[PDB]
Ligand binder design. Structure first.
Ligand SMILES: O=C1Nc2ccccc2/C1=C\c1cccnc1
Length: 192
């Protein structure tokens, strides 16, 4: 019933994405970033993170990294699945991404899962070791949903990131644009 209900949730999001994110315009594209960043901000506000990095990667992938605890990876009684999998398969960003990847740094271990339109492509796997904690989310917006544009506007992101750093003092929030490897821009914000 768990896994069935995941799939039904993906279907509902992809059928009426504007009910979930406001629109499928440029504004809705950018909302995908805000949904992921808000999760990292909550982790900071809970006392566990103080650095968030947003990268616009080649081909308009987005990478969001925080230094929080890492999304949990323990197996749930309820879903029988790792917690990160449950959390990300109920994410609107995941449903509305043609591809999404997570890397969790937790328990001295690096865990990885990938998804397409929210569907896990393989079981969560240990891929390496670490002495840090935190979460990396990378996603590519689905052009089947975002039919006007899939290209992010640096100044739109910059504006709101600076605002979020001013509101959430003590969190360092960095924006980087790597889409043109010959001219990389980086703004980083850290209030008091
Ligand atoms: O520490 C975190 N960084 C994130 C980035 C994207 C999505 C979720 C999270 C998160 C923690 C989390 C989110 C939901 C439930 N439990 C833990």
């Amino acid at each position: 019933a768990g896994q069935i209900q995941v799939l039904e949730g993906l279907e509902a999001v992809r059928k009426r994405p504007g009910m979930y994110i406001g629109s499928t315009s440029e504004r809705g594209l950018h909302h995908l970033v805000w949904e992921i960043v808000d999760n990292s901000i909550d982790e900071a506000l809970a006392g566990y993170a103080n650095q968030i990095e947003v990268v616009i990667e080649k081909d308009n992938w987005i990478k969001v990294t925080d230094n929080g605890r890492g999304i949990p990876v323990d197996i749930q009684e309820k879903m029988g699945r790792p917690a990160v999998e449950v959390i990300l398969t109920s994410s609107v960003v995941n449903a509305l991404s043609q591809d999404l990847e997570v890397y969790v740094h937790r328990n001295e271990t690096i865990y990885h899962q990938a998804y397409k339109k929210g569907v896990p492509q393989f079981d969560l796997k240990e891929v390496g070791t670490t002495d840090k904690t935190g979460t990396v989310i990378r996603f590519k917006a689905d052009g089947e949903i975002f039919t006007e544009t899939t290209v992010y506007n640096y100044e739109t992101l910059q504006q709101r990131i600076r605002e979020l750093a001013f509101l959430n003092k003590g969190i360092q929030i960095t924006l980087r644009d790597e889409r043109d490897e010959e001219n990389v821009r980086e703004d980083s914000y850290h209030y008091e």
